[PDB]
Write an enzyme that holds these catalytic residues in place. Structure first.
Site, short mmCIF file in Angstrom:
data_model
loop_
_atom_site.label_atom_id
_atom_site.label_comp_id
_atom_site.label_asym_id
_atom_site.label_seq_id
_atom_site.Cartn_x
_atom_site.Cartn_y
_atom_site.Cartn_z
N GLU A 83 0.80 -1.19 0.04
CA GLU A 83 0.03 0.12 0.04
C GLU A 83 0.97 1.23 0.07
OE1 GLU A 83 -4.49 -0.84 1.21
OE2 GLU A 83 -3.24 0.41 2.49
N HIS A 104 10.95 -10.39 -8.34
CA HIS A 104 11.79 -11.26 -7.74
C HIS A 104 10.49 -12.55 -7.51
CE1 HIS A 104 15.13 -8.92 -7.70
NE2 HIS A 104 15.95 -9.97 -7.51
N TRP A 115 15.88 -17.27 -5.56
CA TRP A 115 17.19 -18.01 -5.59
C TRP A 115 17.43 -19.31 -5.62
CZ3 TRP A 115 15.98 -13.18 -3.82
CH2 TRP A 115 16.76 -11.92 -4.09
N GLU A 169 17.80 -11.08 -15.92
CA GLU A 169 19.20 -11.76 -15.68
C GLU A 169 18.94 -13.21 -15.79
OE1 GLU A 169 20.79 -10.59 -11.94
OE2 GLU A 169 20.60 -8.28 -12.10
N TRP A 174 21.41 -17.90 -11.33
CA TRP A 174 20.92 -17.83 -9.83
C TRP A 174 19.59 -17.56 -9.65
CZ3 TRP A 174 24.73 -14.74 -12.61
CH2 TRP A 174 24.16 -13.64 -12.96
N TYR A 245 26.92 -5.34 -13.02
CA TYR A 245 27.54 -4.64 -11.85
C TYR A 245 29.05 -5.00 -11.89
CZ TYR A 245 23.00 -4.33 -9.27
OH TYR A 245 21.62 -3.90 -8.91
N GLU A 286 20.08 -2.20 -14.13
CA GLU A 286 20.73 -2.15 -12.86
C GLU A 286 22.36 -2.05 -12.89
OE1 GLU A 286 19.84 -5.39 -10.33
OE2 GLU A 286 17.97 -5.74 -10.91
N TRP A 321 20.96 0.01 -7.38
CA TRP A 321 20.13 -0.69 -6.67
C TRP A 321 19.80 0.01 -5.22
CZ3 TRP A 321 16.87 -3.37 -8.69
CH2 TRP A 321 15.93 -4.43 -8.06
N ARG A 322 19.13 -0.71 -4.29
CA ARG A 322 18.62 -0.28 -3.04
C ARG A 322 19.51 0.08 -2.00
NH1 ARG A 322 16.64 -4.03 0.89
NH2 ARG A 322 17.97 -5.96 0.60
#
Ligand code: NA
Length: 367
Positions: A83, A104, A115, A169, A174, A245, A286, A321-322
């Site tokens: 929310e 994910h 994963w 990806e 992975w 990355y 990313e 990313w985060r």
């Protein structure tokens, strides 16, 4: 002249894509994942971002993540309340920002997370024993998207455009939908069904579809072939994305700094050439340096290499990313700075680049 795969996309969705196609030559939109949800040293504030605390500006592109939605959870796999997420999406869009969403998806066979590599794609695709489960999962996004809509006084419904970036990806090993755990053909079937179900069956008109292989599992000597592993076709992709990355200082990368810079540039050059050939738009969907341990990361390892080649520079946006909350998650993981962080000043100068656009500097993307 790029055109969306949804020939009936909403006016604002069509406008965004057209505007990204125009701006990409001279500019680069900056993005951040979960930017409004929390930062390394704070959580709870309903209008805050580490990125803004450092620069005074919100990111131009806001990334969000749906994992767990499909299980009917009230919050996602990183404990982000759905929310609040809808609130933050509407807020960012209201300010003229861009919205992108990844997913994910939990493993439907084992109940593990993304994963957990237990094979599942074959079960989920049309004809598979758990195809109804895939439908159920996608339905949860349909409902989430409805939650984003405003209805005007005349009864017209208005949605934020979303750069929807699923099954990412997939050339890596992975995720359960990845190479080694799903056949290439089954992956393609999963992607194509996702588009058909959302665009054609459910009539979602506010989506732009982003494809995003991982750079680390692409051979630089055979880049296009690697990039196009599991590629579902031009009729199912709007944005030619890339998660990289690797060339920005990954600890396992023994290439020198100069070599990594060159590889980043080369990867983006090739990405752009692929997008140009297909009439799409390229983006670095990313990236980042975890914990921002690299001096002058922003100008030297990101902006510099992007700007070093005419083609490479034609990417439309870059997302990092985060900024995981340290108190909550118990360790350091972050990709944007916060006040006092070593790279904060370099990040301000990155923001001050005429090339790089944050939210406050965007033209009107939605007309
Ligand atoms: Na700027």
């Amino acid at each position: 002249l790029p055109a969306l795969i949804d020939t009936q996309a909403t006016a604002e969705t069509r406008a965004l894509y057209r505007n990204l196609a125009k701006l990409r030559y001279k500019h680069l939109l900056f993005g951040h994942e979960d930017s409004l949800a929390y930062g390394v040293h704070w959580e709870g504030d309903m209008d805050r971002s580490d990125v803004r605390d450092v620069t005074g500006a919100n990111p131009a592109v806001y990334g969000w993540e749906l994992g767990g939605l499909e299980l009917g959870h009230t919050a996602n796999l990183d404990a982000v309340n759905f929310e609040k997420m809808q609130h933050w999406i509407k807020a960012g869009y209201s300010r003229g920002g861009v919205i992108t969403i990844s997913w994910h998806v939990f493993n439907p066979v084992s109940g593990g997370n993304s994963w957990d590599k237990t094979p599942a794609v074959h079960e989920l695709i049309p004809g598979g024993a758990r195809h109804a489960t895939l439908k159920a999962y996608l339905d949860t996004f349909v409902a989430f998207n409805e939650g984003l809509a405003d209805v005007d006084a005349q009864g017209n419904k208005h949605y934020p455009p979303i750069i929807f970036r699923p099954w990412h990806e997939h050339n890596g090993d992975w995720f359960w939908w990845g190479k080694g755990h799903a056949s290439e053909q089954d992956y393609i079937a999963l992607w194509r069904f996702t588009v058909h179900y959302l665009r054609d069956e459910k009539k979602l008109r506010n989506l732009i579809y982003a494809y995003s292989p991982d750079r680390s599992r692409i051979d630089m000597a055979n880049f296009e072939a690697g990039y196009l592993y599991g590629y579902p076709g031009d009729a199912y992709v709007d944005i030619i994305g890339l998660d990289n990355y690797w060339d920005v200082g990954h600890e396992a990368n023994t290439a020198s700094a100069d070599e990594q810079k060159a590889a980043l540039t080369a990867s983006l050059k090739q990405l752009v050439q692929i997008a140009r050939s297909k009439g799409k738009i390229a983006a670095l969907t990313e990236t980042g340096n975890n914990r921002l341990t690299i001096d002058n990361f922003w100008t030297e390892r990101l902006l510099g290499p992007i700007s070093a080649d005419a083609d490479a520079s034609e990417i439309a946006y870059v997302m990092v990313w985060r900024n995981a909350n340290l108190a909550r998650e118990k360790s350091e993981q972050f990709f944007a700075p916060f006040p006092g962080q070593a790279t904060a000043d370099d990040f301000k100068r990155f923001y001050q680049s005429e090339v790089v656009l944050f939210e406050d500097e965007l033209p009107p993307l939605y007309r």
